[PDB]
Amino acid sequence: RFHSFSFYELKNVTNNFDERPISVGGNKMGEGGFGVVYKGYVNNTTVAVKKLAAMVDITTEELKQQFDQEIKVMAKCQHENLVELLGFSSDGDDLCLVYVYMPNGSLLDRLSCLDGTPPLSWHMRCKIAQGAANGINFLHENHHIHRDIKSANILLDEAFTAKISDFGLARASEAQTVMTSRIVGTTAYMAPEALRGEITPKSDIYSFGVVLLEIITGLPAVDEHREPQLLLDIKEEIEDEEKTIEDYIDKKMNDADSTSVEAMYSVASQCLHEKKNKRPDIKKVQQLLQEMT
Numbered sequence: 001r002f003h004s005f006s007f008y009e010l011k012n013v014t015n016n017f018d019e020r021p022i023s024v025g026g027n028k029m030g031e032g033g034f035g036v037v038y039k040g041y042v043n044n045t046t047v048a049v050k051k052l053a054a055m056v057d058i059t060t061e062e063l064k065q066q067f068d069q070e071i072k073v074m075a076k077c078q079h080e081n082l083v084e085l086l087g088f089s090s091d092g093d094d095l096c097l098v099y100v101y102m103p104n105g106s107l108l109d110r111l112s113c114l115d116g117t118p119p120l121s122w123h124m125r126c127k128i129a130q131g132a133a134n135g136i137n138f139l140h141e142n143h144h145i146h147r148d149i150k151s152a153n154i155l156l157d158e159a160f161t162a163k164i165s166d167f168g169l170a171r172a173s174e175a176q177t178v179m180t181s182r183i184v185g186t187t188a189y190m191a192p193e194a195l196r197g198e199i200t201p202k203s204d205i206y207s208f209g210v211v212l213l214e215i216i217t218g219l220p221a222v223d224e225h226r227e228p229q230l231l232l233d234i235k236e237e238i239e240d241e242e243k244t245i246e247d248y249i250d251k252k253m254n255d256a257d258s259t260s261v262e263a264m265y266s267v268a269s270q271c272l273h274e275k276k277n278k279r280p281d282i283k284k285v286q287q288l289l290q291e292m293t
């Protein structure tokens with residue numbers, strides 16, 4: 001179970017929600033469409049505090065439903081490859097979620113070496129891939145579709161254990177795929193059918209395939225000042241025999257052998273089937289990654 005903080009704790013331990021980035025003396029550690037994440041301290045524990053906010057176009061009602069989803073999901077799902085929700089504040093007109101602080105931040109930022117952190121070794125990238133898959137597997141076995149799988153939502157503890165975060169968009173799975181009029185996610189990560197409003201766990205797999213390409217290449221999922229602009233189009237250029245995965249391997253690594261890299265790439269490529277029904281389910285992905293080390 002959880003703890004019910006009021007603001008005055010959360011406000012006051014985040015330097016009154018100091019929105020300046022950590023690196024310039026504030027408390028901001030990251031931000032997304034649904035809020036800003038702040039560094040705080042509760043008792044003797046460093047925490048991450050997410051204060052919700054419509055950073056994109058969405059309703060207060062939608063924010064509140066997302067807040068309630070996250071609690072509901074976290075109340076049911078405890079696992080070492082998921083983040084740990086300590087508690088929340090609903091006090092007044094501002095919603096906060098409090099988590100155990102993750103000392104290595106997001107996988108997106110570590111693949112970028114943001115703030116000067118050292119590149120991830122191939123050995124740690126394999127541990128991260130296996131961990132994220134274990135976490136997704138746990139969600140699907142508990143009949144939850146994540147719907148927002150991306151490197152920004154994979155956090156890393158001091159041993160680089162991968163932790164899936166951000167469950168406000170999650171949905172129960174079951175019978176047959178369902179459709180919604182509200183299309184959510186980050187387009188560079190999204191499966192075809194999810195772009196069309198279909199809700200299905202197969203879309204989590206596709207998104208995980210993109211994360212695996214990020215892990216192998218260190219490239220961003222989308223980059224305007226790059227060609228191609230979309231990472232997932234790398235599969236088409238390798239499949240057309242123009243290039244090979246080795247042309248794209250991240251150079252900021254000295255411990256990556258061709259055989260394990262091709263094994264990871266092969267998994268990513270299966271995940272990235274445009275046809276939803278040709279993709280491996282998460283159990284299969286998990287086993288493929290286990291066989292790879």
Ligand SMILES: CNc1cc(-c2ccc3cc(C#N)cnn23)ncc1C(=O)NC[C@@H](F)C(C)(C)O
Pocket residue numbers: 029030031037048050083084099100101102103104105106109115117155165166167
């Ligand atoms: C995005 N960044 C963080 C996020 C989090 C964190 C922990 C749990 C949760 C849950 C959600 C949600 N929903 C969002 N975040 N979250 N914990 C730390 C960081 C961070 O920036 N750590 C510092 C390092 F990066 C380093 C020193 C190398 O700079």
